[PDB]
Each structure stands twice: as structure tokens, then as C-alpha cells.
Design an enzyme around this catalytic site. Sequence first.
Site: not given
Ligand SMILES: [Cl-]
Ligand SMILES: [Zn+2]
Ligand SMILES: [Zn+2]
Lengths: 338, 338, 338
Positions: A64, A169, A199-200, A222, A306
Site C-alpha cells: 500500500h 509501513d 489500506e490504512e 505489508d 505506526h
Molecule cells: Cl497496515
Molecule cells: Zn501497512
Molecule cells: Zn499500518
Amino acid sequence: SMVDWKLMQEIIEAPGVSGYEHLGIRDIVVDVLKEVADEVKVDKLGNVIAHFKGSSPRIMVAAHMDKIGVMVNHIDKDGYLHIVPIGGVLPETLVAQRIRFFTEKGERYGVVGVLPPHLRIDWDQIVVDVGASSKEEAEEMGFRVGTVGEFAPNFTRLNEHRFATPYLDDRICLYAMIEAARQLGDHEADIYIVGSVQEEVGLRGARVASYAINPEVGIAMDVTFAKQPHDKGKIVPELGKGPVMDVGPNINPKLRAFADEVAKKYEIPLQVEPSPRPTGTDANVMQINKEGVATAVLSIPIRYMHSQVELADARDVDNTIKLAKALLEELKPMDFTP
Amino acid sequence: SMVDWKLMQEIIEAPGVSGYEHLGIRDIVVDVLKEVADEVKVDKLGNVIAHFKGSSPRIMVAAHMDKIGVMVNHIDKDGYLHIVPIGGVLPETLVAQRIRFFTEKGERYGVVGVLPPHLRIDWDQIVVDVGASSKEEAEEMGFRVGTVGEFAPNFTRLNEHRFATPYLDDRICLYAMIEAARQLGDHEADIYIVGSVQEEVGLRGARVASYAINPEVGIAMDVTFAKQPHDKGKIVPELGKGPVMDVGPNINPKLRAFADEVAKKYEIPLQVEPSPRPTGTDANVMQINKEGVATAVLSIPIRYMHSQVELADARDVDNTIKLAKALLEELKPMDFTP
Amino acid sequence: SMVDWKLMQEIIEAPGVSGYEHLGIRDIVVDVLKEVADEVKVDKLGNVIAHFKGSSPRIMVAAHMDKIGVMVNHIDKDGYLHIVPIGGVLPETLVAQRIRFFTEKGERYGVVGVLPPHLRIDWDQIVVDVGASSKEEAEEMGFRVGTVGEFAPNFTRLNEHRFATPYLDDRICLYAMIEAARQLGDHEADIYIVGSVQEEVGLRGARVASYAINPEVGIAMDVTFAKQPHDKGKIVPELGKGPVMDVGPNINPKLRAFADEVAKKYEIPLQVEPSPRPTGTDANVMQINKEGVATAVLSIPIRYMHSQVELADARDVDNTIKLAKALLEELKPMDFTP
Ligand SMILES: [Cl-]
Ligand SMILES: [Zn+2]
Ligand SMILES: [Zn+2]
Ligand SMILES: [Cl-]
Ligand SMILES: [Cl-]
Ligand SMILES: [Cl-]
Ligand SMILES: [Cl-]
Ligand SMILES: [Cl-]
Ligand SMILES: [Zn+2]
Ligand SMILES: [Zn+2]
Ligand SMILES: [Zn+2]
Ligand SMILES: [Zn+2]
């Protein structure tokens, strides 16, 4: 394989939170893939879909493009911004941090302040200072209701292999997928390489891209969680022990066994992650696309997911590039029925 | 109709947690349906789809093959397993219980231990003993990261009609659907009987099976909650009062009225369950499939859902077989528009 | 020594909760001992007392026949049983478990149900379902106020040595004592082998048996706690490291030293358990019998005591048989004065 540190950092730092991947990352993905793909197109949600023509089976690989980030909810009379998260940004990681905003007047920074102890975790305590003195000034500077922002870039290479930066990420896997694509030799499979959007915020781009592509086989690239402090020994994958491939309901047994054989053949270290639930990756929606897809997840392990200090090991990135390339080159028609 | 206790127990006890229905239940469903269906196929997610050719309308009936269960997250240095749930297994039902694991060396048991009172509800308190003394020994015994397990079988027939066993959900309805299919006489409808996969992890198999079949009418056969101790009088269906058919947004009014008429015609007792939300059954995803499907839910009431002592009444099973067969035989083209 | 798996399982599974040892275990103990003892008698509380005639000293060895269990307090209008514990049964181990009841109409099962999460540790939450629909039906099935029940049998041999089953406490030691008795060769001591009753409700059978026998020396064979998960490193004995013999106030120093010498002579591994209090075994009441008795405790270590998954190691059982036989054969007149 081999890690290109300059390209990798460029791909990590390009603008693009969920729904706004067109602010930078998309053009980079298109440009790099257009050089090697037979055809590259962007769909209505902004997915980049690059076709490397082959025979069979039809495979979609997705990493992503979107980052988690924040959005300006409103600007107050003193020119401070009040923000809300886009995706899984936690308020704790915002304290005394810089945010890079995409304003009408270019990229502009703000800081999330802290209250000195003698005047005393939730979104209401989060207020962004952009150097403005009034609502009108913040607006003249280019800030608006709806302005989006990202963790400020800070690329830190710690030693030969380990490095920490916001947005591994999923820019680290997007980088790895793109390198595998650039190194791709002959292949029997009909390959679609997809830079997915959103995606998030619920796997939305991969959902529509899978529908249009209609693959028989799907692989999501991912990041995943790596062993780190205070994890209570519950995380299996570790930094430096190679790419990770889940096992579980989201993971087709035949495809996953094929991946083991390929890893063994090319002598690539391969970790196993137990995933008892449909994953929180694009492979979730790929698997239940249309009549169903044989799916697997190929991940780079990172610490501190994150947050601004996501941390990975370049040996894992290298081996992920190598494994993705080998899977794509070795893939051939087979029966994926469980 | 009539309950075949031996076949019913075989269908209940066959291995198959979500994502691993190929470990036993799938072959049984295929074998029994191949004898009566015009065609039986297994799709990429593992759904069994059996076609009983007819005219109209096209109906899909689905009962799920998967069981809730557990997966090994990791093995510790002393050879104990640390597990995570697949589907809605609650830690409380694991205390001092046996688990049947599907290892590389066949089926092997483990026990979830308890701590004696003088040394003193959550997953971290759950540790499985498999008789091993080290990580290496547990691995030699066949246990791996990703090994799946089920509640150990314990079939208890209490009297003429009542019986308790792990996994009435949803093997009891799969059994009933299969018996109805075997007894099916002439019919106008074009019938697809589906053993669905991964219902317990988000209705995933029925989603792709509905897409491929494209039915006009859909019926999910799953268990539902029956009146039992400590339910505060809130549960409507009762053991021994017949099959249950929901009413509510997931339930097409014309199809549900047709079901009442059929139940009255064949003098089959039929209970009503109020379901104000889209259901937690395969009918949820069938209804919103493609252009939309007229759906209903046909359930066997059980007590103690998702535990090792799920308890049902064979009179209800018999009447469910009878009602499913009659619906399929009576179904004819009609206007399902609400 | 050598473990006879068939006899051991028969002895474990024979009915007999505290006060009801006459329901099965007693006759088995009498029958096996009558073959080797000079005389076997049953007293008014139900103790089995087998005399192996010798000279001196007079020794009593006791293992208890009773199991912990439950009793029906009352049957409610819907035919559910409300139960209370006999001995140290904890409510947590009853959730979603089967109970074997001894009714007027033979052995009958019930299940302890669980309440599904969406309708929500103490005895009031425990309700037994026996498949009945009314109080009258449960009564016709044979259930009464005062009906007793046990954990349902489930014998699980995990590998060569380890095995888990309800009621290793104290059937595993009763088995070991009985095997030692059957293998007993010549001996100088005057030996009484006692299958005691009501150990689990306050050592009541051993109290009266000790009074009648009037031994000079007393050994209780009961299980003890073994190292297991979440024990915080506080438990000394471990599975597979041999029989355990306590040290402490309940334990005569001369007898305990003699036991060490015997273990060394026969090369039997012997663990030490520190017991700073009078024990919770029959040796407690034997020691303070009449003018006082030289006592010791000889134990098999198990995990998960008082639950359905009590777990032991057959190497320990074998070595316990060997040690009991050797103590009885080596015992001779000596001064036990501390
Ligand atoms: Cl993710
Ligand atoms: Zn991801
Ligand atoms: Zn993520
Ligand atoms: Cl197509
Ligand atoms: Cl369900
Ligand atoms: Cl069609
Ligand atoms: Cl005890
Ligand atoms: Cl005397
Ligand atoms: Zn369920
Ligand atoms: Zn179900
Ligand atoms: Zn006990
Ligand atoms: Zn005991």
C-alpha cells in the site's frame, strides 16, 4: 535484490496519506514501474496497477502507498489547529512532535505542544501550533479545514543494517515490491503489481483493484510486528531473521507450501507468523474477491509500528526483494484447492 | 427426515476449524453429496458447492463446515504451547479442558492446566501442556507455530432426544442440510447446497460462494440461542419447539411468509426469532451479494453456544430436516420484492 | 514396579467420591489385596484394611480411595440440577464440563453450561443440564437431592511417560501402593495397607483406621504439587524427578533418614518437599493417633491438582512403587525418638 538506500528513502518520504496518495507517492510508483511494466494505469480510487504480461496463473501483488496521518478539523481563534487521525495514529505519539502539512501554500510544519507540569493521552489535549497568532493568519498560511498532515520525515540509519524512520509501513514493502519488479526476469505467471490506496482506512483500494484484476492468486506485501521490548514474548518474527509469511485462514495452504519450497530452493530465510484471523492487510479483501483468490502475505518485520520510529533491518528487506522475485519467477499453474 | 445418530456424530466430530476444513469435514461433505447431487465442486477457499439441477428460482442453501478453535502462537522453552483463538473461543471454556491438535505427526492432545489456589479469565493465563519437557521435544512431537486445535470430542446422548457435544455449531445444521439433500425428491427450484468455509471468522466462504452461484434466493442453516439458565428470559426459541426462522432486516418478507405456509402445510412446528440486525450467519453476506438476494435463516436452537457442551434436542433436528426438504421441494418462482 | 496401564486406569476411573467409596473403588481394592494379604477387612466408615503379617515395627501405609466431587442440592422446576462441592472442587473447573452422576437408574451424565457473552466463578452460576425438561422428569431419570457426581473420566496418555486424567489424586498413589503390595517379598515389619476413606473432607477415614491399627510407623501416599506454569518458581518437586518425600514437623526425622538410605541403596531418585505445617494428607492424623506415630509422606508429583487434567509422569509412578516396596521390605525395629 540489494538495497538502494537512496531510492528506498525517497519512496518512504514521498507524500501520501490515505486518500491523498496523489500528493507524491503515486507518481513515483507509476514512473518507476512504467520503465519495466507492459502497461501502468491508475484507477478511480488512485490505485497504481502495473501489468507484467504472462500466461498463468494471474497473480496480483499489492503493497500500500498510503501512510497514516492527521487531518485538520478546525482552526481556533488563536490560530492553533485541532486535528483528527487518518488511520491508526495514536495521540501518545504526537506529543512534542513535528507534523508536515500539505497546505495551499506548499508543505508547512506544525508542532504538537506539551503543557508544562505545573499547569496540569486524548485527542482534546492535542493542539497544533503553526506559528500563527489568529485564525485568519493560519488560513493565510494555507491551513484549512481538511488540510492533511504526516509525521515529519526523520530518516535514521543506525548502523550497517538497522534503520528507523516514520512510514516503513508500508513504504518499505512498496520499495521491496518495486525492486523485485525491476529485477524481474522471465516468468510464466500473468503478473499485476499494485500500489494500493487507502489500506490504512479499511483496505479500500485493494478491494477495487482485486475486483478489476480478478486474480487467481494474491499476495499482500505489508509490514508485520517484530520482537521488541515489553512484548511479553508474544511476537514470533524477529528483526534480521528474514521475510515473514503468515499461516492461518487468510493463507492458502498450497500457495504457502509453494512459498516454503521456493525459499528453500533459493536459500532465503523465511519466518512464520501465526495469524488466526483474517489479516489486517490487503490480502484480507483479495481473498474474498469475487469467486475467491488463493492468497498469502509476505511481510517485512518492523518494530514500533505506526510511530515515528518504525525500525527495520536491511537484511530482511534484501531477502524480501529476493523472495518476491523468486516467487513471481517460479509461480506456475497449480491446483490451489485447499 | 429421521436422525441418523451415527452419521450425525461423524459429521460433528470430523476435523475442520476455520481455514482448515480440508482436514476432514470437507471430504465427508463431498462424498455424501456426490451420491445425490448432479455435480459437486470445491472452490479456492474450500467451499463445497453441490448442484441439484432445477429450473427456477436459483437457491443457495449454506451451512458452515468450520469449527471455532485455537492456534499455537509459540512454544516455550519448557515445551508448553501458548495459543490464540480462531473464532469466538472464550478463555473461560478452556480451563482444565483437553484440546485435539492437528500436528505433523497426526492428532495429538494437550491440556489446559489450572493453578492450584495457593499460588494465585485471560489468554495469558492459558498454557497448554502436551507432555513435553522442552521446546525441542514439543517440536519433535509435531507441534509448530501455526498448529491448529479443536475442543476434544465428547459426544453425550443424555436421553431419547437431548444430547450435548462440542461443535453442534454448525455441524448439526450441516448434518440436517445434508440429510434434507439426500431425501430431496422432485423440485422446481435450481438448488445449490453449500458447505461453507470460514463462517466463524467473518462469513468469508459464503461470500465467495454466493458470488459464484449468483442465487436469487438464499437460506443459511446455522444454530441459534435457546432458552437456558441465566438468560434473564430474553431468549425466545426453546429446545424441542422446532426449527427457528428469524424475522428482521436480513429476512425477506415474502420468502419468510412462504416458509410459514410450508411449515403449516407439513404441520412442522416453527419458532420465530426476532433479529433486528443483519444476522451473524452466512445469510448476512448472501443477502448483499451482487444485485441482492432474497434471504432467510433456518436454525436449530441449542444451549451453551461456542462451548464444549452445546446441547440440542433431536426432535428439532428432525423437524429441521423435514422443513428444509419441504421448502426446497415447494419453492417455485414468485415475486420476492418486499 | 513397572506400570500396568490397564489396572492403573481401572483404579483411577472406579467410582468413589468421599463418603461413597463403596460405589466401586472399595471392591476393587479389596479384591486385589485379598489375593496377597493375610486378611482384608472393611470398617464402619468404609476403610479397606489389609494385613500383611510380620513382626515389628507395626506400620500402616495409607492411600485414599475417595475423589473430590459434587452433590445435588436441589432440582429446579425446569429440571436443572443445582450442585454443591464434596471436597475441594472449584467452580472454575466446572464450566462447560461433563459430570458423571450416580443415580437410582445407573450412571448418567450432565453438563455445566455457559452463558453466551451477550447475556452477561461462583456456585450460583453453576447449573447442571441433564437433558430434562421439568423437575419430575429429572427425578424420573434418577436424580435426587443428595445424588453425587464426579468429573467425567477422560484418560489421556500424551506420550511414553506423561498422562493426564481426572483423579490422579489419589488413585495414582492407591495404584502405586497396591502394586507395591502385590510385589511385596519377605519383610520383618508387621504391615497394614489401608485404602482410606474421606481424606478429601478432613482425613476422616485414616483417623479411625489409625486408631484401630495402632501403628508405630505411618506412611501416607498422596499426590503433591509439581512445578507447572504460573507457579512463580515456588514449587520444588518436578515431574519425572522421582517420588517426593516431605520434610517438616509432620515427618519423623529418623524414619525420613531411613527413607533416604533406602532410596540411595536401591538407586531410586528421591525429591524433597519442604512442608512447614502438618500436612494435608492422612499422615496428619496418623501422627497424632493415640500415643503418637512416627510418620512420613511418600508422594507422586502431579500438575493441576484437583482438576480434570491432573498430569503425572509414569517414571515417577514406577519409582514410587519401587520405593514403597523397598521401604516395606527394609523396615526393621529402630528407635524413632526424634
Ligand atoms: Cl497496515
Ligand atoms: Zn501497512
Ligand atoms: Zn499500518
Ligand atoms: Cl476475467
Ligand atoms: Cl456461527
Ligand atoms: Cl448468472
Ligand atoms: Cl488430597
Ligand atoms: Cl495394640
Ligand atoms: Zn459459531
Ligand atoms: Zn454457526
Ligand atoms: Zn485432594
Ligand atoms: Zn489426595
